[PDB]
């Protein structure tokens, strides 16, 4: 029962050590828009080094694969695989590929709000997209990812596929909003899945944290010992929860969304699962542990 | 009086209605479809003046200013209707943000409003300064989210960004979530904006239209109401229904809108009691049986 305890010294290194391996969300953790979190490439290399496993777990459903291995690169992550790399985009795609097939053939397409990423990650596994070229097929779904293009006639659009039970509705997450560098906020899919699902009468099949379905996705490729894995997230309502919920341990980072001051809030509220077992000022902090 | 749903006809329709000093209508799927009036409807209103009862009419829907939907009522022969009677969720957000922006002259901001040019001349008509008219924007004091068309990524952006000022109202007209066109398909309602403003801005709004119960405050404050004497008749269980019960009134449901019979039954067999209507007719025309 988490006690959101500041990780170091001994402790740390104690940590780190029966660790198999840490999975890291990566906005308001590795970087925060362009600019990195110091120490951050630095540390991805000890822990290779050191042998312990890595993996990337993000609710960005921007990002197809190819461009957020480029990312890592560009920004001074080096030696990433791209089997590393778990999106909510990638989720979407796999899931939706898993409800579609069937002993029946001729399936259909994804109706998607979002943009050319979280497209391309669905083309990628072999789905067919309404609104490509050539045949319009029966849609078979509707996909909510972040749509900077989200508008009223799309919703409407959204909900006339909908009217038909047998389409799906998913979304990428239920993450509400985003900072941004300037200070301001952009809305997150959980504000547009939140329009649809009004709208439709629908309940969205959620793919990511803290949905246990991005857990399944990883578990599908590695072997995760829950137990041996560090979560290591800077948001205690998708990653920390999401962590506690796949039986994790979970380390909350101060780079990004939430505070140290709401984690105690919630400890105080006895909400267990928004409990970080251990905190750190940055993730650069983990490095005295190897 | 607990609802049983059932068919206000004969006797039970000449007591309920001999007891009544008056009926508030809801408007869309009750007196009309689109540009279809429910037949019988303009009659009824009629007799109901002839019979000395009470009128009163309340609308989730913001998109015609009150001069406007007065003139709509008489286009389509509703005839003897006056526009103070006439009550939508427009009207009543401008009374609200008019009764809270209020103060110091030198105080009073603007409202951002999502919504159309109907519910922009409602805030106007009660004196309220809108974002985006010409001149100056003074501070934005209050978001107001209404039935909006032009709904987009960008204003819901610009929403969020006026409510990280945490003494920034939030106000919606309702949340009806969906409604229907008159080609079978439908437009998103309110309700789902609402939700994506309120969850990107990690807000509460206030909600004005039914089932709030501020839209029959809004309707106590120029008229007295009895709510024990008063019919509420609606095609909405989960909006009039619900209305009418948190108000204390007698509940009709009318079968010509977006509500059927059968989900009023399932909301009895689950006990689900203030989605009960006390009765319900198929059609408003039906309640003129009941007058002389
Ligand atoms: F990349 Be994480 F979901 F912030
Ligand atoms: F006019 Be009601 F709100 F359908
Ligand atoms: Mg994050
Ligand atoms: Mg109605």
Not at 35 to 47: K, M, N, S, W
Not at 83 to 91: D, Y
Not at 102 to 130: K, M, Q, T
Not at 267 to 286: C, K, M, N
Request: glycine share 10%; net charge negative.
């Amino acid at each position: 029962m988490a006690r959101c305890e500041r990780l170091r010294g001994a402790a740390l290194r104690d940590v780190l050590g029966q660790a198999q391996g840490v999975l890291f969300d990566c906005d308001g953790v590795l970087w925060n828009g362009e600019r990195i979190v110091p120490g951050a490439p630095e540390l991805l290399q000890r822990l290779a080094r050191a042998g312990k496993n890595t993996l990337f777990v993000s609710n960005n459903s921007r990002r197809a694969r190819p461009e957020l291995a480029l990312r890592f690169a560009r920004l001074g992550f080096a030696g990433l695989r791209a089997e590393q790399l778990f999106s909510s985009a990638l989720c979407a795609a796999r899931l939706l590929r898993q409800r579609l097939p069937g002993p029946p053939d001729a399936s259909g397409a994804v109706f998607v709000l979002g943009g050319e990423g979280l497209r391309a990650e669905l083309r990628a596994a072999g789905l067919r997209l309404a609104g490509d070229p050539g045949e319009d097929p029966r849609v078979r779904a509707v996909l909510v990812g972040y749509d900077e293009q989200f508008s009223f006639s799309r919703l409407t659009e959204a909900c006339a596929h909908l009217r038909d039970p047998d389409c799906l509705l998913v979304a990428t997450d239920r993450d509400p909003w985003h900072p941004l560098s300037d200070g301001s906020r952009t809305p997150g899919t959980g504000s547009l899945a939140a329009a649809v699902e009004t709208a439709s009468g629908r309940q969205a099949l959620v793919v990511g944290k803290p949905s246990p379905y991005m857990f399944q996705c990883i578990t599908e490729d590695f072997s995760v010992d829950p137990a041996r894995t560090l979560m290591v997230g800077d948001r205690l309502e998708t990653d920390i929860l999401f962590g506690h919920r796949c039986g994790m341990t979970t380390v909350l980072t101060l780079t990004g969304v939430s505070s140290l001051e709401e984690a105690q809030a919630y400890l105080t509220a006895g909400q267990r699962d928004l409990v970080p077992h251990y905190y750190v000022e940055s993730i650069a902090d983990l490095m005295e542990g190897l």
